[PDB]
Amino acid sequence: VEIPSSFDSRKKWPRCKSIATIRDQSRCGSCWAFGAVEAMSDRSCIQSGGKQNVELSAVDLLSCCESCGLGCEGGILGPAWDYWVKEGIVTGSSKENHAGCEPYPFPKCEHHTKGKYPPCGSKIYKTPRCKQTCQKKYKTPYTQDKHRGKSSYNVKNDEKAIQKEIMKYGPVEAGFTVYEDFLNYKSGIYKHITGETLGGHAIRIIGWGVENKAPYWLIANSWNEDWGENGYFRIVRGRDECSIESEVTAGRIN
């Protein structure tokens, strides 16, 4: 297939409203779970021709997956996608929207940036319990609200393979190494220039483009709409910048 110079999942599949939704992980190291349920929401809609148009629950995955790591203390991508295949994930929106089976329990906050929400600060919430119970107003039992995948896989560490995967099957989850200068990002095309490592982050790659001859990936962060470019960022593409091309994981419903 010929890869276009730019691609935006939001423009290819506009009926799938999850694709253009920015979430907030709040005071919790649940990035791994957010990138997962976001991309799973997108792909469930894309791959079902819009029939499964849902917002999957970050808290169900965060609180119930035993193999995915340490909940709000951080986690692992492969097992999150395996959990979606084997057990599935229920629906649930943000705390503020309070929709679906298990909405997120934690409020929006600013992640080392200025804006209209309280600062997140340095303390993290305890991982929520695995409650297995839909909110009172939601009239589907927890087990009957589960959305499952058929397959999960790592994507090859190859730029064209990642582009082909996104444009055929939808947004992917990806890990990268966060350095201190990432916390200063306001806009533009990120690359690591200063600062020491702060560990790994997990995000959702929705497309790609080029500006002034500089190729980039277009990425949804999970730090609310005040962060970066209305919740998104761009990062250098093609050079495995911060390992962005080396920890890509996704999956399919069929």
Ligand X SMILES: *[C@H](CC(=O)N1C(=O)C=C(OC)[C@@H]1C)[C@H](C)NC(=O)[C@H](CC(C)C)NC(=O)[C@H](CC(C)C)OC(=O)[C@H]([C@@H](C)CC)N(C)C
Alpha-carbon distance values, 5 to 11, 93, 169, 208, 209 (Å): 14, 34, 18, 8, 6
Q: Which residue lies nearer to ligand X by CB, 7 or 185?
A: 185
CB 40 within 8 A of CB 91: no
Pairwise CA distance, residues 130 & 15, whole Å? 32
Among 31, 89, 166, 218, binds ligand X (CB under 6 A): 31
Annotated catalytic residue, options 147, 221, 224, 242: 221
The closest of 136, 146, 229 to 189, measured between CA atoms, is 229
The span of 25-33, 88-96, 130-138, 227-235 binding ligand X (CB under 6 A) equals 25-33
- First-to-final CA distance of the chain: 21
**Closest by CA position to 91, among listed 162, 26, 146, 50:** 146
Q: How far is the CB of 73 from ligand X (least distance, A)?
A: 5
Q: Which residues pair with 152 in a beta bridge?
A: 251
Q: Among 16, 36, 37, 75, which residue sits at the site for ligand X (rule: CB under 6 A)? A: 75
Cα 122 → chain centroid: 22
What is the longest distance spanned by two Cα atoms in the chain?
53
| Span interacting with ligand X, options 43-51, 56-64, 68-76, 152-160, rule CB under 6 A | 68-76
Determine, following the binding rule CB under 6 A, whether residue 108 of this chain makes contact with ligand X: no
Give the nearest distance from C-beta 148 to ligand X in angstroms.
22
d(CA 125, CA 73): 9
**58 touches ligand X (CB under 6 A):** no
Catalytic, 201? Answer yes
Which of 27, 74, 106, 220 touches ligand X (CB under 6 A)? Answer: 74
Active-site annotation holds for 101: no
78 binds ligand X (CB under 6 A): no
Q: Which residues are registered as beta bridge partners of 169?
A: none
Q: Which is nearer to ligand X, 32 or 138 (CB)?
A: 32
d(C-alpha 78, C-alpha 88), whole Å: 14
Q: Give the x-and-dash track for 148-187 against ligand X (CB under 6 A).
A: ---------------------------x--x----x----
Per the CB < 8 A criterion, the answer to whether 76 and 29 are in contact is no
Using CB under 6 A as the binding criterion, the count of chain residues that bind ligand X stands at 18
Could you say whether residue 92 binds ligand X (CB under 6 A)? no
> Closest approach of Cβ 95 to ligand X, in Å?
17
Residue 163 CB: number of other CB atoms within 10 A?
Answer: 19
Angle of the 77-86 helix axis to the 31-47 helix axis, nearest 10:
50
* From 13, 32, 106, 179, residue interacting with ligand X (rule: CB under 6 A): 32
Cβ proximity to ligand X: between 74 and 92 the closer is 74
Residue 64 bears catalytic tag: no
Catalytic residue set: 31, 201, 221
Footprint on this chain of ligand X (rule: CB under 6 A): 29, 31-32, 69-70, 73-77, 175, 178, 183, 198-202
